[PDB]
Amino acid sequence: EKMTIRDVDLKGKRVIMRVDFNVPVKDGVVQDDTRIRAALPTIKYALEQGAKVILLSHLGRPKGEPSPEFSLAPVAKRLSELLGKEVKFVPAVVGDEVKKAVEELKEGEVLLLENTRFHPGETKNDPELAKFWASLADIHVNDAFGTAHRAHASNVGIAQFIPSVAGFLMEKEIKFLSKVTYNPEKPYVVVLGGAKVSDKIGVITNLMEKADRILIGGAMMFTFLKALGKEVGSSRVEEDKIDLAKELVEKAKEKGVEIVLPVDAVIAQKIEPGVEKKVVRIDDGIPEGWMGLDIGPETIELFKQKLSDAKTVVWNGPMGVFEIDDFAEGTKQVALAIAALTEKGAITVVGGGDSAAAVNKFGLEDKFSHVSTGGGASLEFLEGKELPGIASMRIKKA
């Protein structure tokens, strides 16, 4: 049990809060505000306790220098709308401009700083950056579960200078995942998909230690499929990870862990709605020209079968390009198959930005045991070791 924002006196204090506002933005408008809304409880609570609140967050992965497209300005506007209260935005991470703003902050006021990653020290956990930030406040609140797997200046760095306590989101996430992390009822099935291959493939070696079956879909299926010889065609494959994929399929066998790959795919030459799609089999090969964009009808049946008896399901990654209705069936049917197990008593967890968006799109949000956008953080949590952004928080004592 970590100390939470509830275990400290906030009245009159300056609280620097690390939140995960790493949301999708298009033309200066937040496309998906799930992460912002998830953080609201914590923010509203601090404001009512009469604290002066400073928010810190990253957005994307800037080179370590400013880029208008990665600015947190659109997020401050959205937060203001959601909160129903003006949010002050300072387009700076360090400096007099930042000191001045924090200085003129009244009780029950919120200030959001610019993208933490515009500073090179952030991802390096630079002690000088962390010290400056710690100097602006009395307490540090870590509510950024989605970034808990990263040891950065804003979430881990600052904690070594001032007390660091958990916010409500961070609390809820840990409370839930801990059940599944230590005592997972079997069969425990993991479902991986999505396009962010290079980031997820590494968790497989560890997940392989506690899971019974691992179903792979999304674009990830092709790095594994190609590793097995198969003609992927035009499909997205992560060249630099093929050799690892080969070692993982091999190791899974030696360890009695079943890795289920797709048998058929819905392909199409273009990635736009309404076009002509043809369901092909992988053994038959995907002709250079057609790209795999969703798991086919056969795989949907296979995955359903392999899921039918699961007592614990962890899902991260859309099965196909669910954004375009033409290639969303794999995702919908899998989501439906998993939501059904929940009613039958299985513990079901959805983690990942688009996966959460996917369940929302189908009206399934309340059909799973737990839904999270902290996609990478949750997969790593399941591995058992304490995450750096969780370890940095004060233990609750007496």
Ligand SMILES: Nc1ncnc2c1ncn2[C@@H]1O[C@H](COP(=O)(O)OP(=O)(O)NP(=O)(O)O)[C@@H](O)[C@H]1O
């Ligand atoms: N076969 C496919 N080819 C290309 N893109 C795909 C395919 N299937 C799924 N994707 C895309 O990958 C995206 C989902 O990516 P990803 O970011 O890895 O998932 P996520 O649920 O957000 N997980 P995380 O990043 O771990 O929070 C969506 O834009 C999908 O359309």
Ligand SMILES: [Mg+2]
């Ligand atoms: Mg994602």
